[model samples]
Target: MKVIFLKDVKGKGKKGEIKNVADGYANNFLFKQXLAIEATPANLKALEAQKQ
Candidate 1:
């Protein structure tokens, strides 16, 4: 699935950056082992809201 990293992920890119990964090892499965947030419209909108 497609997603955006919320924070620095070793071997992965940094925040606000779009990336690709496996379904078996993806989703709000971060903020713990791997800190990342889904690149969903809601979250993207939230990001925009924050930026502005």
Candidate 2:
């Protein structure tokens, strides 16, 4: 699954960065910690806007 990091994740990624992760990993770890969001169209657009 594709996800966007909400904050720094050490060896994973930094905030606002997009990454592809295993579905289970994303669901269990990332979601559990509220550390990332699914990379949906709405989130992508929001990320783009936030970058500017």
Candidate 3:
């Protein structure tokens, strides 16, 4: 699955961008900690359409 980090998460990733992550870690660890949110189809398209 893909996700966009809400803040700076070390090792996992940086903020405000989307990337793919395994189901195990991305699904549970990140969500439980409020560190990230799932990158849906809309999310990915939107970011790629207008990223720096």
Candidate 4:
């Protein structure tokens, strides 16, 4: 599954990164804690629209 990181994950990548991660990890950790979102079309568009 794809995910858009909202914050810098210490062992992972930095913020605003579009990464391909396992569904279990993303759902159990990232999504559950609000650290990331599923890299959906809307999320991708939002990221692209945001200024760095």
Candidate 5:
């Protein structure tokens, strides 16, 4: 699955990177802990719309 990293993850991609990772890892670790977000169209659009 694709996801947008929310913070600087060591050994992983930087913030805002769209990466393909295992679904279990993403959901069980990243998403479950609020460290990242699913790379959905709405979230991608929101990121672009946000002023950062």
Candidate 6:
């Protein structure tokens, strides 16, 4: 699954990065911990706006 990191995830990814991660890892930890958000169209746009 593709997602954007909401915070720094050690040895995985940094905040603001959009990466393809394992479904299980994303759902079990990233999602549960609020560490990342799904990379949907709206989320991508939001990330673009944030970068600007």
Error of model 5, residue 9, in angstroms: 1.5
> What's each prediction's clash count?
0, 0, 0, 0, 0, 0
Off by over 4 Å in 4: 47-52
Best by TM-score: 6
The local distance difference test score of each candidate is 0.69, 0.89, 0.79, 0.86, 0.84, 0.92
Q: How many backbone overlaps does candidate 1 show? A: 0
Model 5: worst 10 consecutive residues (lDDT sum): 7-16
Q: Which residue pairs come into collision in candidate 2?
A: none
lDDT, residue 15, candidate 2:
87
User: lDDT tens string, model 6, 1-52?
Assistant: 9999999999888998999999999999999999998999998898789879
Put down candidate 1 lDDT per residue, 1-52, tens digits, no spaces: 6776777776766777877766656643653454666777897788788779
lDDT of 4 at 27: 91
Indicate the TM-score of model 4. Answer: 0.79
* Model 5 spans > 4 angstroms off: none
* Candidate 4, lDDT over the whole model: 0.86
**Candidate 6 wrong stretches, greater than 4 Å:** 47-52
| Per-residue alpha-carbon lDDT of candidate 5 for residues 1-52, written as tens digits (9 for 90 to 100) | 9999887678766787899888998889888877788999999899788835
| Residue 10, candidate 1: C-alpha displacement in angstroms | 1.0
Q: Rank the candidates by lDDT, best first.
A: 6, 2, 4, 5, 3, 1
Tens-place lDDT per residue, model 3, 19-52, is 8888888877987887777898786677567664
lDDT of 5 at 41: 97
lDDT of residue 28 for candidate 3? 77
Q: Each model's TM-score?
A: 0.64, 0.74, 0.69, 0.79, 0.79, 0.81
Using lDDT as the measure, name the better of candidate 3 and candidate 6. Answer: 6
Better of 2 and 4 by lDDT: 2
Could you report the Cα RMSD, in angstroms, for every candidate shown? 2.6, 2.0, 3.7, 1.9, 1.5, 1.7
